[PDB]
């Protein structure tokens, strides 16, 4: 067995975009094991220690003007540049969700019908799933499994709705997503 202690070091450069490239924040961070020790926040303008472990580094790096000026302009040469490079296939990537409605396999309490609205294979993750009973939105009884990121640039989610079904009622699952101009709807006819 391998019992040797491990020593880990991570370096991350995060480009945060607001309203496209209008507002950009660059966050450079160093993490020893699970402890972030020093970082460079473009909103601050210089390296700052996050813990005592990183004090020597912030001080040393802030003494190098060439490093400091590159970091201060990186918001443009690094962040905005990379955004322009990947925008067409990342920011603008769109894959329509597959939507289907069927009753849950469980169905606990008798005179009740737990409905399931399955929404999968979509991108981006931003999505709106709502339930309606005869054209009026259902706030109560609605429960979601959450937004699941599949790791292959795809998302999925399950949004349930408990109902006291009455013949003739129409329960609609409506999905709004950037991939479509108008909402997608699937109806359960009770």
């Amino acid at each position: 067995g391998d019992t040797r202690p491990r020593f880990l070091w991570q370096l991350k450069f995060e480009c945060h975009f607001f309203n496209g490239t209008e507002r950009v924040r660059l966050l450079e961070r160093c993490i020893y094991n699970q402890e972030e020790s020093v970082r460079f926040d473009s909103d601050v303008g210089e390296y700052r220690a996050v813990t005592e472990l990183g004090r020597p580094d912030a001080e040393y790096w802030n003494s190098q003007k060439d490093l400091l000026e590159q970091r201060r302009a990186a918001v443009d040469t690094y962040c905005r540049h990379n955004y322009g490079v990947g925008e067409s296939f990342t920011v603008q990537r769109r894959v329509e969700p597959k939507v289907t409605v069927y009753p849950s396999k469980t169905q606990p309490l008798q005179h009740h019908n737990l409905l399931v609205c399955s929404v999968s294979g979509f991108y981006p993750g931003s999505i709106e799933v709502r339930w309606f009973r005869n054209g009026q939105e259902e706030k109560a009884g609605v429960v979601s499994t959450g937004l699941i990121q599949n790791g292959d640039w795809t998302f999925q989610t399950l949004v349930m709705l408990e109902t006291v079904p009455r013949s003739g009622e129409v329960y609609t699952c409506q999905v709004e997503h950037p991939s479509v101009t108008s909402p997608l709807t699937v109806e359960w006819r009770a």
Binding site: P5, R6, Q10, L11, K12, L53, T90, S118, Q149, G151
Partner: protein, 179 residues
């Protein structure tokens, strides 16, 4: 509303190194440290953009030198093993005899070293399985995805066996047709 992360790491004594780009949590690419080439997460990205993989190795060398300096500075304080949270799901609702994919989600763990194996009816699978590299997390722990394409049936049962230093015993997450 959008975040692009260049994430790298070096780990001793495993001598493991990684360099990757992330977009809103999804990997754009990572560099193969041995072949010294860019590995795009999705085939098409390679036709829409490029990256000089060779140069990433310059960063990994600096990362290693920095790790050793920090290791000594901390008086050789080792990392605390944090066991993974493991979940198994299908990429889409399962339908009998309808092609699907089993996803083994390994999350919130560190250090970035894990052994994952798929088991179909108690026996190890290998056909068509794929996996991603370690993905970054805001808390600085890692995420990872392992995949297994399969054909649903009421007979075939599966298990995702995960080993990690933070786990006293191998963790097996079971899966089988129920719907």
């Amino acid at each position: 509303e959008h975040v692009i992360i260049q994430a790298e790491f070096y780990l001793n004594p495993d001598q493991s190194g990684e360099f990757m780009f992330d977009f809103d949590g999804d990997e754009i690419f990572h560099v193969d440290m041995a072949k010294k080439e860019t590995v795009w997460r999705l085939e098409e990205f390679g036709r829409f953009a490029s990256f000089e993989a060779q140069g990433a190795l310059a960063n990994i060398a600096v990362d290693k030198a920095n790790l050793e300096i920090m290791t000594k500075r901390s008086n050789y304080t080792p990392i605390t093993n944090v066991p993974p949270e493991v979940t198994v799901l299908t990429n889409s609702p399962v339908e009998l005899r309808e092609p699907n994919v089993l996803i083994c989600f390994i999350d919130k763990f560190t250090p970035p070293v894990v052994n994952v194996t798929w088991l179909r009816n108690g026996k190890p699978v290998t056909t068509g399985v794929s996996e991603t590299v370690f993905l970054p997390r805001e808390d600085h722990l890692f995420r990872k995805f392992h995949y297994l394409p399969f054909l649903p049936s009421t007979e075939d049962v599966y298990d995702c066996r995960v080993e990690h230093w933070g786990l006293d015993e191998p963790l097996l997450k079971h899966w089988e047709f129920d719907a």
